[PDB]
Amino acid sequence: LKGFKEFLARGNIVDLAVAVVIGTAFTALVTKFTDSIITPLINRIGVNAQSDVGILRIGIGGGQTIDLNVLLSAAINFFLIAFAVYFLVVLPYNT
Amino acid sequence: LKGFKEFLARGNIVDLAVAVVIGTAFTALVTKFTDSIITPLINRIGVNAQSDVGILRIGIGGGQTIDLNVLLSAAINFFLIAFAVYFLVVLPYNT
Amino acid sequence: LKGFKEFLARGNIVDLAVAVVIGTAFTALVTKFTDSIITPLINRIGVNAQSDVGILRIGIGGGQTIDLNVLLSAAINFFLIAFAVYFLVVLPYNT
Amino acid sequence: LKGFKEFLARGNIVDLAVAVVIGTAFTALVTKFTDSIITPLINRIGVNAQSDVGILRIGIGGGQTIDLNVLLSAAINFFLIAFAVYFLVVLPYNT
Amino acid sequence: LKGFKEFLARGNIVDLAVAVVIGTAFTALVTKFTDSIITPLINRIGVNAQSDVGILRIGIGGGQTIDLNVLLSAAINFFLIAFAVYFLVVLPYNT
């Protein structure tokens, strides 16, 4: 048990490994928040995806989509991350 | 060996590259748990996702889901990462 | 709320853990900017991927694709991340 | 070329970015080893996840699987990243 | 306007968050080159999916797979992450 446990507490490895444990975790509470709740409110939009033809010589030549409104949800991803975390850092810490 | 091994041991490229190797590995364990186990208990819930009528100008007109309960399985994703790391990594360090 | 929200703010666990909240959340606005808008414009290219005849022991032995231009949309992926990170973040900081 | 190739050698960007270039790169060799070689021996466990009768008010009424295979595979996702980083990076460094 | 683009620039976040921007985007370009130029050549090899038998008592029991050269589709990006970075980022820096 010595090799793994006692090397843990040193230096910046505990400041960081658990910190990218916070970067991926919280931004999933809040991204999967965007894209499950809101991106369907952004999938009711639909006006996008003006038809496109790409004739692949391997035979995919019916049509394609140039679909824009998930870019609209890509800001719903970033902003509400940057809203769910912007509230919690400013209130107890930034002051 | 010289170009790689010698410039292996330096600086933060270990405390910081290996530390985003603890981030993914521990949060590819516990997140892959959250949806292996809990989300289909939350997907047993199901009563979510009242339909969302989005008529694409490309021609998909059946229907869409404003699909909630994987959001509920994202709080399950942020919370239960923050407890499995609160005991293995925090209880023998913070104490 | 005490042991949690006040161990919140000490050291590099705020600067680093949310900089990867900014690592994933910022690029997702601009990566998905390049994949909903551009990669479909790069699906109009379509030329690349002359077939590959490759069998498996399961048995898939019809045809493969040796497909390039998403390499040519992965490059559009790295570049505009660099442009969008250079404008809102670096242009007010490099000054 | 001066704004790019002289702001790079400053501070910790080289030690920190190339690091998360190491972080994701290395576990991309190890987590996929987990899930390509082993996770499908873990789907050879087979008997997991007795059907989960979940009533959706919206249209799915046949069954739900809650597969513990991929949790036990996530245990193969965190244990096996630990060995690959301990042998190539730590044995000549911890010594 | 102010509190955003002026608290933006302080400390290491314009390093760190843009440095993990470097960790997200660079590995993605080299890995999709690895996934699009190369997967074809690698799915021509067919080392993957050696037939296996895993009895789901929940009803997938026809034939299974144990993917071996998806391990071989992964080594190609980890090393090429370590090869594409060495020419663009390292050779004018290590000098």
Author numbering:
A (entry chain C), B (entry chain D), C (entry chain B), D (entry chain E), E (entry chain A): 2 to 96
What does the paper say about this structure?
MS channels are widely distributed through all kingdoms of life, including bacteria and archaea, where they play a prominent role in maintaining proper osmoregulation. Sudden changes in osmolarity, such as osmotic downshock during exposure to hypotonic conditions, increases turgor pressure across the cell membrane. This in turn increases the tension within the lipid bilayer and activates a network of MS channels which respond by opening typically nonselective pores in the membrane to release cell contents and alleviate the pressure. The first crystal structure determination of MscL was obtained for the Mycobacterium tuberculosis homolog (MtMscL), solved to 3.5 Å resolution. This structure revealed a pentameric channel with a relatively simple subunit architecture consisting of a cytoplasmic N-terminal amphipathic helix, two transmembrane helices (TM1 and TM2) connected by a periplasmic loop, and a cytoplasmic C-terminal helix. The assembled channel can be considered to be composed of two major elements: the membrane spanning region that forms the high conductance permeation pathway in the open state, and the C-terminal cytoplasmic region.
